[PDB]
Symmetry: D2
Subunit: 247 residues, 4 copies
């Protein structure tokens, strides 16, 4: 189909938005290697791999802690050996550590920056050299990267807005080869980590233009759009899928 | 896809606008589109037969974009003949550029009447009957966000007006599930702006991608926003500019 | 006094933010020409001239409806013959026409665009030719140009966001002569026309980072900064003075 | 004299932009503490302290590597004891590690992020608890945070764009106390590390609206404006001083 000849790599693909991305990209004919962080995620990752192979798509699951740069890098290396150079890189893994500014610890800072910033940069450093002409790099951001609407998200918004400059710099670095680099900014999304039924869901919905949480298919649809033929001229852009949070 | 939906596209007879109407029709929308001069009648009617001869209903409506009455009645005629519009695409626009001291009041009026008033008039006519989950898609320019050079002040002002109009529309219509977005083309290979142009090399040099885009690039972005995958995108500015702003 | 010997022109300078701007620029030593829109404001405008004169400044008050391009243009021309070339142009006049999208009229569109966009472009055209090197063009925008945040501000936000592209284009057109062009975006500001005690004041304050309305001096201080020696390298920028409305 | 009675803290204040900021804030009457990173800067920093003192200002120079968070934090604590609670914090120190994307190392990433991102966050965390109401936090960014413009600055643009979200979250975190948080974005500025006559200067100048490099005083005037009474209602903003680089 659209992605028939392409190889995709998705960090954190065993669940949530990452699972929706691997399903959409596989349904478009890409082979996908994806990572899972916890050993508890291993069985579901193997189940998802068996799921894709029962539809004729090739799939690989590689454990890799997002906090460990060596594991992220060697996971990308293993994917390359098994599937060939990746055409579509999706930096999906991230963590949301929030709270009062005076209680933030160096452990909070280090984990947030290692996962939300360093891991996408390491995967890009490992993938970019062999990336074929016309490749796609797709970072996953947040609506909080552009607007911190409330107190308590300073550390997280800083880590996500770091992706804005990295993505714009990557578009200049790789554009001569036809490789695009874009960042997608989810608004509130109904996941295990952020249920739409939560007590704070109403406070979030009130500041949206569309009065409801989004779904993982919205993020996966934007990622598939950037991965495919219609995204070939989109690069260096920040693309909100936020329900009008910024409007 | 867009089966059962009606799309309206200003300036749909040519260039980017023709690619938008063709792509939207291939996804199953019925289409009405406007053309400015009566001389375009032959091209527009041929495009209608091209659309009708693929299973779609289609209408070509003469309407000078400068005249608010013509844009409005073109929208009114489409809703009676095709039904209420689900997808409004404000594609028509004009590019008047030059030294700042040589800009005339006539240049200001035409740029603002075509690039701003016409999209606002088409929206005001369509929005009342627009079914829930409808889409408003304004066509902007990379110059709305970055001028980059001297001589485009008036055009960049008219296009950056869409930024605030589009964000306000997202708030005004979000309760009905209607989204409002603006697409910002970069350089695109058309008859009005050939990729083989006189000043092509200097413009290509400031892109991240070392070439002009194609009309299919804008048409695919509009099709994405018009379709099911765009249901949660609203109030956004989406560049398709080859990295001009990067 | 960093503006001694300079001529400033301010549209809509007889009241509110425009009056604070003209007073601040005069206190920094500029001679000032300013417009007033309605003939009903005449005596307050003439009083402001008498106040400046009683402080050693030359001053002129010129009637000009913002909707009439010819009146804005000849007001700038008259200031140039009487005071000399304009060094600092401040496009402050504007109108706030708000309401439901289905109730906006074509006359609402016409007046908003004639006043919020055309009049500043006309005044700039009239002033720019004779403007000395190092001159300053300062448009007054709105936080609604960058974020609507609520329903009912569609047209107003469109007219103000037009200034964003106009200002960036003006910086490119006039930068070789050393002339800067910037737009200032007031947030909520306490004026007689926009009271901090209004019924809608509480909805605005709740979404601010600083939990109060600003004052006209905050806008006048930003404009005085862009007008002076410290603003010589600032051009093409949008500068919020919004109390953290943009978060 | 707008800063009479205020204590200012400036990272990297021994030279370049930071030295112009410490001199300007002192001339406006603030007592000043500043850090220097290298031990080789000891003599210049102590001489600058002597220069301030001779002019009636209290001043201190504190050695502190930006890479070591404990040194950054201990410098802020030492300043609080010796001069008093900080009213104005200026995070100026940073490093520019640039080059081809394939030559970036993990060490380059670690040093860039520790100095440009972690150090400002640690300095803020130490100053914020005792910071009096109406205090000022002023981060120094880069025009490259908003526009990369060329290949080879990916890492630096990422670290600086991280300041964008950090600053917006800080504005929400501290606005209730009247503390503002802003980021200033220099364009090309004539310093020892970035000479205005240096090679490639013509390349950059050509893309500016003003056809020249700026000076360190341009950055210092913007910081002085934000520190003073006129900056009271400016918070959460990104303020370019870039010569129209972004125009």
């Amino acid at each position: 189909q659209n992605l028939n000849g392409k190889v995709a790599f998705v960090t954190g693909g065993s669940r949530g938005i990452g699972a929706a991305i691997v399903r959409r990209l596989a349904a478009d004919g890409a082979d996908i290697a994806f990572t899972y962080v916890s050993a508890s995620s291993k069985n579901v990752a193997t189940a998802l791999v068996q799921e894709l192979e029962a539809k004729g798509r090739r799939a690989r699951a590689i454990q890799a802690d997002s906090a460990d740069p060596a594991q992220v890098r060697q996971a990308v290396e293993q994917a390359i050996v098994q599937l060939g150079p990746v055409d579509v890189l999706v930096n999906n893994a991230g963590i949301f550590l929030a709270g009062p500014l005076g209680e933030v610890t160096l452990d909070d800072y280090e984990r947030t920056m290692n996962i939300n910033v360093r891991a996408p940069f390491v995967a890009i450093q490992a993938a970019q050299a062999s990336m074929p002409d016309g490749g796609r790099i797709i970072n996953i951001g947040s609506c909080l990267a552009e607007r911190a609407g409330r107190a308590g998200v300073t550390l997280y918004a800083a880590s996500k807005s770091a992706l804005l400059g990295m993505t714009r710099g990557l578009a200049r670095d790789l554009g001569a080869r036809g490789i695009t680099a874009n960042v997608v900014h989810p608004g509130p999304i109904d996941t295990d980590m952020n249920p739409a039924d939560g007590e704070r869901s109403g406070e979030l919905v009130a500041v949206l233009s569309l009065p409801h949480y989004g779904e993982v298919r919205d993020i996966a649809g934007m990622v598939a759009f950037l991965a495919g033929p219609d995204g070939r001229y989109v690069t260096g852009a920040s693309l909100a899928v936020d329900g009008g949070f910024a409007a």
